[PDB]
Design a protein around this ligand. Structure first.
Ligand code: HEM
Ligand SMILES: CC(C)(C)OC(=O)N[C@H](CN[C@H](Cc1ccccc1)C(=O)NCCc1cccnc1)Cc1ccccc1
Length: 454
């Protein structure tokens, strides 16, 4: 409670913190509502405390640019640590300073458009697997839970694009490879924020927020694949070729592989559910997209890398969905030095925070922000959108490295699925969708819809 004076001293407003707890009791409605509220109550900048940890929110796009881009390497290089990580210290998204700068370099060529175009044929084949599982549920007019069928697809793309493994997860939901990979503001991480001194305790104990079993399975599963291709197109290959030179270690390689799975599993699948919900409760947008897809790919023509970038309304739909549901919710950098940015003094050790969800729904930049209106991303209006207000993939050197992959992956899933099906609300569909009051951007109730064969 000896750090709870910091914002009062700097003249920064914020809600008054309780001893030890900081302002965390105010997460009872979740990060995003607390963010929105703070924005409205306090203005362009405010402070609060995760326990003893001062956090300064900022919403000025100049200041956001300074932090995210201009002063990334100098000052705002790392995210705030969260729990016991074990050997995953070496994962790119968790690593810090120069080890991050080295991993980011070693892994950037992996995510070029040129490597992505080579992955389209592989991400296409499981779009076909996706249709056949959906059609089995459309001919038996039973409502569908998107997260299971989309999760099966995202999961199918990940194992293929990162290791070559080819499974029909929805039908082999219990192959050993599919088991490990799916697993694990909850009672744990709040305790971490009130007792962050307990992290080094769990480290020496080898306790990990990564189930020690999943990680042991893939550490060895990778070293089998590694020594089965060596010697006799995916992320593992691209990393194995990179350490054929400063170059990527062996346990370092396992760790990035693991980050890529958590990265694109719950995210690629969660997003596709958000887009199918909006498509269902807005059937004209849904028709408008089916017309655009049939126009570029007549006769259910299979999508190609080039035809995907041809589809503008598709891009508009995806982009608007991420405005209502930016699954990061917040961006964050730890300030590593006393700094002054855009006229404001920022003391060393503050976490700086961009409240994405809240800025995506700000009426001061967005007309009717709670409404799903894709036209805001029309080539006409897309110019009047501040790229430091709309940030579903972050920005600057530490933006989402897998952005071009994620967009492509989702767009391929959509094109095939709208080439073949229409999606209609059920009586059991939650309208309007309520967001989880928990710690992830997800729906209260899972999205259930009706699927019909075109
Ligand atoms: C629609 C899906 C996704 C969204 C909305 C998303 C969003 C984000 C955001 C907002 C960040 C933080 C950006 C920042 O701090 O400025 C991030 C980081 C990251 N994402 Fe994504 N992401 C998605 C999917 C993926 C996928 C599929 C991968 C596959 C490899 C991936 C890999 C990463 C990595 C490695 C980072 C950490 C970057 C670093 O610290 O160097 N993400 N993502
Ligand atoms: C700032 C704080 C305290 C949250 O944690 C960090 O220090 N940074 C994050 C590290 N933990 C997560 C989740 C995870 C879960 C299980 C095991 C390991 C990791 C992480 O690895 N995300 C990358 C994967 C990912 C996820 C969604 C979009 N893109 C990529 C990186 C991060 C965080 C939030 C959004 C984006 C990226």
């Amino acid at each position: 409670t000896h750090s709870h004076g910091l914002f009062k001293k700097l003249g920064i407003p914020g809600p008054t913190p309780l001893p030890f707890l900081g302002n965390i009791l105010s997460y009872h409605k979740g990060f995003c509502m607390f963010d929105m509220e703070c924005h409205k109550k306090y203005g362009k900048v405010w402070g609060f405390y995760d326990g003893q940890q001062p956090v300064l929110a900022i919403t000025d796009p100049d200041m956001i640019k300074t932090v995210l881009v201009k002063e990334c390497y100098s000052v705002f290089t790392n995210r705030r640590p969260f729990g016991p990580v074990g050997f995953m210290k070496s994962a790119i998204s968790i690593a810090e300073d120069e080890e991050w700068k080295r991993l980011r370099s070693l892994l950037s060529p992996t995510f070029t458009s040129g490597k992505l175009k080579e992955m389209v044929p592989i991400i296409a084949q499981y779009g076909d697997v996706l249709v056949r599982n959906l059609r089995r549920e459309a001919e038996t007019g039973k409502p569908v839970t998107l997260k299971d069928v989309f999760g099966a697809y995202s999961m199918d793309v990940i194992t293929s694009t990162s290791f070559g493994v080819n499974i029909d997860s929805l039908n082999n939901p219990q192959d050993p490879f599919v088991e490990n990979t799916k697993k694990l503001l909850d009672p744990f991480f709040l305790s971490i924020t009130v007792f962050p001194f307990l992290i080094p305790i769990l480290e020496v104990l080898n306790i990990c927020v990564f189930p020690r079993e999943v990680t042991n399975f893939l550490r060895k599963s990778v070293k089998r694949m590694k020594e089965s291709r060596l010697e006799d197109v995916d992320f593992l290959q691209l990393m194995i070729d990179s350490q054929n030179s400063k170059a990527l270690s062996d346990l370092e390689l396992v760790a990035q592989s693991i980050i890529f799975i958590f990265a694109g599993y719950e995210t690629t699948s969660s997003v596709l559910s958000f887009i199918m919900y909006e498509l269902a409760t807005h059937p004209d947008v849904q028709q408008k997209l089916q017309e655009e897809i049939d126009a570029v790919l007549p006769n259910k023509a299979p999508p190609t890398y080039d035809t995907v970038l041809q589809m503008e309304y598709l891009d508009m739909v995806v982009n608007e969905t991420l405005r209502l549901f930016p699954i990061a919710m917040r961006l964050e950098r730890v300030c590593k030095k006393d700094v002054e940015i855009n006229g404001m003094f920022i003391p060393k050790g503050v976490v700086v925070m961009i409240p994405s969800y809240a800025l995506h729904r700000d009426p001061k930049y967005w007309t009717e922000p709670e409404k799903f209106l894709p036209e805001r991303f029309s080539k006409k209006n897309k110019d009047n959108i501040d790229p430091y207000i709309y940030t579903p993939f972050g920005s600057g050197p530490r933006n989402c490295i897998g952005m071009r992959f994620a967009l492509m992956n989702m767009k391929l899933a959509l094109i095939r699925v709208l080439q073949n099906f229409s999606f209609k609300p059920c009586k059991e569909t939650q309208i309007p969708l309520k967001l989880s009051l928990g710690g992830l951007l997800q729906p209260e109730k899972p999205v259930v819809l009706k699927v019909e064969s075109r």
